[PDB]
Amino acid sequence: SEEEEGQSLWSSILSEVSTRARSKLPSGKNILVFGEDGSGKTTLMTKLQGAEHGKKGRGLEYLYLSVHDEDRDDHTRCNVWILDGDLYHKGLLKFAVSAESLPETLVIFVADMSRPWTVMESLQKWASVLREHIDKMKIPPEKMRELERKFVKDFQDYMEPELPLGDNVLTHNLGIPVLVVCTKCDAVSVLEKEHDYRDEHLDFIQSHLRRFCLQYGAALIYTSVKEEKNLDLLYKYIVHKTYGFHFTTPALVVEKDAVFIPAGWDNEKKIAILHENFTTVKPEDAYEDFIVKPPVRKLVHDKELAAEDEQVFLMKQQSLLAKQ
Amino acid sequence: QVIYLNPPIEECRYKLYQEMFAWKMVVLSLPRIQSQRYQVGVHYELTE
């Protein structure tokens, strides 16, 4: 008690004198990545760390996004995790997430063009899972609204790096650091050639992705594995969001390989500017209208080899002999 | 006068998670039975 107050005074003096080594990094930095299974996100995260490991352990991992705080020559990490289709492992966030981690929330997302329409659907599913996790917290909603106000201010503060809100400005209110990416765009030319991913269709896909991101209040970066597009830019954006670094390069929409529109650098009209580009299809063309579900590989169907059973053929031939 | 870790505690946690994952892979690594390997006709690849 008295010794508790004494060691507390010791700790208070320690916190006061901690200014010598203060501002080292965002304390409790831990990240996450949303999605369903088949993301192939192991390589994405490895390139994100710049490392390489094919250790695709199912469920998730405490992926150590080593945060080399080189601006102050400090260092940290970020306990990252990826999301799969393991609904049996839906309780991973129960192991993973926490109330402090709720303040320390850091989420990521990426892309894969194979089921890119379903990748939007899978993003919706992962978002639903995340919202379920958020609800499972059952935490002080006053703090929830406070962080919502802070995030709304940041979106208002999300100016062009040289006002009123939209109808659905983060309708899926993230209220947390959430990343997205239009990553893994290696077979884009193959998609246009074979899957009929038209240039108008691909632009509409990008625009609808932006629209859905804004509906969740999100931003994404185009990339591909061989491209390694915006990887340093992604790290800089991550540091700017969580670690509070200064994002340097201006966001662009010209770069097909590395389209990374900054959050708040565009608005509903900027998407509406792209929304007019839907020439051949209607401006509200469904992703399902443009989706592909090819039934490849000719799945078995080996005739179900069977005949009349023992008593079955017994009665069959018995009736046959009755006829005979 | 500024103490550190060998390695960082996050590094240790990652190593422990890797060890647990390796233990799990000790079971999971057993391939699914190649019953379709008897079947022929397509030079496809078996899934995970």
Curated annotation (Swiss-Prot), chain A:
One of its GO terms (cellular component) is centrosome. This is Cytoplasmic dynein 1 light intermediate chain 2. One of its GO terms (molecular function) is ATP binding. One of its GO terms (biological process) is microtubule-based movement. It is found in: Cytoplasm, Cytoskeleton. The chain holds residues 27 to 373 of 492 of the full protein. Keywords: ATP-binding, Cytoplasm, Cytoskeleton, Dynein, Methylation, Microtubule, Motor protein, Nucleotide-binding, Phosphoprotein, Transport. The keyword S-adenosyl-L-methionine does not apply. Belongs to the dynein light intermediate chain family. Homodimer. The cytoplasmic dynein 1 complex consists of two catalytic heavy chains (HCs) and a number of non-catalytic subunits presented by intermediate chains (ICs), light intermediate chains (LICs) and light chains (LCs); the composition seems to vary in respect to the IC, LIC and LC composition. The heavy chain homodimer serves as a scaffold for the probable homodimeric assembly of the respective non-catalytic subunits. The ICs and LICs bind directly to the HC dimer and the LCs assemble on the IC dimer. Interacts with DYNC1H1; DYNC1LI1 and DYNC1LI2 bind mutually exclusive to DYNC1H. Acts as one of several non-catalytic accessory components of the cytoplasmic dynein 1 complex that are thought to be involved in linking dynein to cargos and to adapter proteins that regulate dynein function. Cytoplasmic dynein 1 acts as a motor for the intracellular retrograde motility of vesicles and organelles along microtubules. May play a role in binding dynein to membranous organelles or chromosomes. The keyword ATP-binding applies.
UniProtKB/Swiss-Prot annotation, chain B:
It is found in: Cytoplasm, Cytoskeleton. It comes from the Eukaryota. Cytoplasmic dynein 1 acts as a motor for the intracellular retrograde motility of vesicles and organelles along microtubules. Dynein has ATPase activity; the force-producing power stroke is thought to occur on release of ADP. Plays a role in mitotic spindle assembly and metaphase plate congression. Dynein heavy chains probably consist of an N-terminal stem (which binds cargo and interacts with other dynein components), and the head or motor domain. The motor contains six tandemly-linked AAA domains in the head, which form a ring. A stalk-like structure (formed by two of the coiled coil domains) protrudes between AAA 4 and AAA 5 and terminates in a microtubule-binding site. A seventh domain may also contribute to this ring; it is not clear whether the N-terminus or the C-terminus forms this extra domain. Homodimer. The cytoplasmic dynein 1 complex consists of two catalytic heavy chains (HCs) and a number of non-catalytic subunits presented by intermediate chains (ICs), light intermediate chains (LICs) and light chains (LCs); the composition seems to vary in respect to the IC, LIC and LC composition. The heavy chain homodimer serves as a scaffold for the probable homodimeric assembly of the respective non-catalytic subunits. The ICs and LICs bind directly to the HC dimer and dynein LCs assemble on the IC dimer. Interacts with DYNC1LI1; DYNC1LI1 and DYNC1LI2 bind mutually exclusive to DYNC1H1. It is linked to Charcot-Marie-Tooth disease, axonal, type 2O: An axonal form of Charcot-Marie-Tooth disease, a disorder of the peripheral nervous system, characterized by progressive weakness and atrophy, initially of the peroneal muscles and later of the distal muscles of the arms. Charcot-Marie-Tooth disease is classified in two main groups on the basis of electrophysiologic properties and histopathology: primary peripheral demyelinating neuropathies (designated CMT1 when they are dominantly inherited) and primary peripheral axonal neuropathies (CMT2). Belongs to the dynein heavy chain family. This is Cytoplasmic dynein 1 heavy chain 1. It comes from Homo sapiens (Human).
